[PDB]
């Protein structure tokens, strides 16, 4: 009949898009002081009757977070000192098994024509041979930048917000696996407090799962897809390097100071971690329960350790108090499950010359931490890798799997408020 189109401005309709998110924090390398103050009133509008398609494996917030953290890392290493004069022949000895060394070297002073024979302690993983003669591990590959000893490696809650005209959609499905149509959806302006924890094999200090323990993958039949299992109850891990280390400032140039490991005050012990063998047994039992729902109620589920790679993936690689640990995980994944005080100890090694990511040509010296380091954290997720009579082994590396374990609930949409629709309405003359 009499139907003329009419323009409506401000209708509830959006399109899947991807824009440049910005950060928000409350009150460190991640420069969370520079983010907009997190609003004390976080508005969460529930979208009744709405059902949206998600896909945490195409999610661009993970690809943006992955490059944002790397961009923040290269940013917080520019004004720091370059340890290239350290690339010199070192005379190392064992310290009174044979892991941490005691190296001496001729060093430039504050006068360009004066040398000095100073000594320092280096872990084994930072030196290679040619008294025995050694050298920093990075000298034949890359330059090295000592991290500024004022910035903190502490994961501060980061909030990713969409600009005006865009929106973020959450997923209120307590059993929502990776993909599919989320039944209960709500819109947010900023994501929750996300701690940028750089981890390996074990997802540290992450968010839990409500109801039961979830398990996610693109194609669980594809063995080349890392399984992202997320616990519902946290199993607690305590890590510590018990050596009471000392920091020694070494003037290597006008205004240039190399912070070295002076000496150990007291006992020399082993860096390790503890988990409760009971709380880890029941947590492996819950994981093994959901593993049969798509593998078979009769097939056996076996756990083994890593089968190769680099130190950053073959071991629980994380950060504790400012030093980078590398914990052997064979004591956690050594159980075969059939159709039907306690403490585990993980021997961790410590390294100072680390390439944070796969960065080629760039290395960083983490300065030593004075005191006795111990940190208490929850392992709330896990990154498995089945073989392919079904056995599962840990591992990871691709740091976007970490961000994907917390950005699965979110999705970026673009508001398009212009809508054309007909009614029996026409304008005058």
């Amino acid at each position: 009949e009499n139907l003329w189109v009419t323009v409506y401005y401000g209708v509830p309709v959006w399109k899947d898009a991807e824009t440049t998110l910005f950060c928000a924090s409350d009150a460190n390398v991640w420069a969370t002081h520079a983010c907009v103050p997190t609003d004390p009133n976080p508005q969460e509008i529930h979208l009744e009757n709405v059902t949206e398609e998600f896909n945490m494996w195409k999610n661009n917030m993970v690809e943006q977070m992955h490059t944002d953290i790397i961009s923040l890392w290269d940013q917080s290493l520019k004004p720091c000192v370059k340890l290239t004069p350290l690339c010199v022949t070192l005379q190392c000895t064992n310290v009174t098994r044979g892991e941490l060394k005691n190296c001496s070297f001729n060093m430039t002073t504050e006068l360009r024509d004066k040398k000095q024979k100073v000594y320092s302690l280096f872990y084994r993983l930072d030196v290679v041979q040619i008294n025995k003669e050694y050298r920093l591990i990075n000298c034949n590959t890359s330059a090295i930048t000592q991290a500024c000893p004022k910035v903190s490696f502490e994961p501060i809650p980061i909030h990713y917000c969409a600009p005006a005209g865009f929106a973020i959609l959450k997923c209120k499905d307590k059993k929502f696996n990776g993909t599919g149509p989320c039944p209960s959806v709500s819109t947010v302006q900023c994501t929750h407090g996300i701690k940028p924890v750089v981890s390996t094999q074990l997802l540290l200090n992450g968010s839990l799962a409500e109801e039961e323990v979830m398990i996610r993958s693109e194609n669980i039949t594809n063995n080349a897809k890392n399984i992202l299992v997320q616990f519902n109850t946290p199993v607690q891990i305590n890590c510590t390097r018990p050596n009471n280390n000392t920091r020694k400032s070494i003037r290597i140039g006008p205004g240039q100071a190399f912070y070295a490991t002076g000496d150990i005050i007291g006992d020399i012990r082993q860096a390790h971690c503890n988990v409760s063998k009971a709380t880890w047994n029941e947590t492996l039992g819950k994981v093994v329960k959901q593993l049969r729902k798509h593998f078979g109620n009769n097939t056996i589920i076996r756990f083994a350790n890593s089968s190769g790679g680099d130190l950053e993936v073959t071991t629980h690689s994380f950060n504790c108090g400012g030093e980078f640990f590398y914990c052997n995980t064979s004591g956690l994944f050594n159980s075969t499950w059939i159709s039907n005080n306690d403490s585990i100890t993980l021997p961790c090694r410590i390294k100072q010359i680390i390439n944070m990511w796969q960065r080629i040509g760039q290395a960083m010296y983490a300065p030593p931490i004075q005191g006795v380091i111990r940190c208490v954290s929850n392992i709330t997720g896990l990154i498995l890798t089945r073989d392919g009579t079904e056995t599962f082994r840990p591992g990871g590396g691709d740091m976007r799997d970490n961000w994907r374990s917390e950005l699965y609930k979110y999705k970026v949409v673009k508001i398009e408020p212009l809508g054309v629709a007909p009614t029996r309405c026409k304008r005058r003359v």
Partner: antibody
Amino acid sequence: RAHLVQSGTAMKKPGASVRVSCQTSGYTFTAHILFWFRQAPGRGLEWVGWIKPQYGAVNFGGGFRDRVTLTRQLSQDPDDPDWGIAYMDIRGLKPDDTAVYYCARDRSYGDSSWALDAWGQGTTVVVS
Amino acid sequence: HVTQSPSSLSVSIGDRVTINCQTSQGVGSDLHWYQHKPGRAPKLLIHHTSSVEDGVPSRFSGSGFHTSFNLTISDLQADDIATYYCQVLQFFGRGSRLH
């Protein structure tokens, strides 16, 4: 662009070990998974294992985990960081291990789709 | 398991030639077709069901879903004489040789 160059054929007695290299060039090595397939004379292609070159994580087929070890050698030139060269080490060569071993590269950048778009010419290993 | 039919196929130049590929379970869409000639390396023809690779002659076609997949060749020529593998994940088919 992508091109995989494998090594020459091998003649080994039973019980010996063989090293197979796979030189790559023309693509980001760390963002493309490298598989390893073999084909016995008359049989079809059989999968041995893959390796993600960014960190070197590996995963094998049926039984190859005990005898095959997959490593790599990343580039360190700050201008040519693309290429790499993987290695397949097989221990305890049985006579039935005589086949044509292939070095495969997944097309997907970062992700894995098993759609092998860049193959090596092949390496014929015989055990007798 | 991957089963291709027919195992062998009598062919003539210029015909509409097509080969089936079956699977033991649900696959979805990520099925890959390969051409393998003696002495040479395999060549990825089509990936993820019906996504033809660049440089491949436009006569190659792909269709299928679930547990049945196809590899159709319209106006066959003297270059399309080889065994044809269909690949799901890591399981390559035995092939189907033309002559």
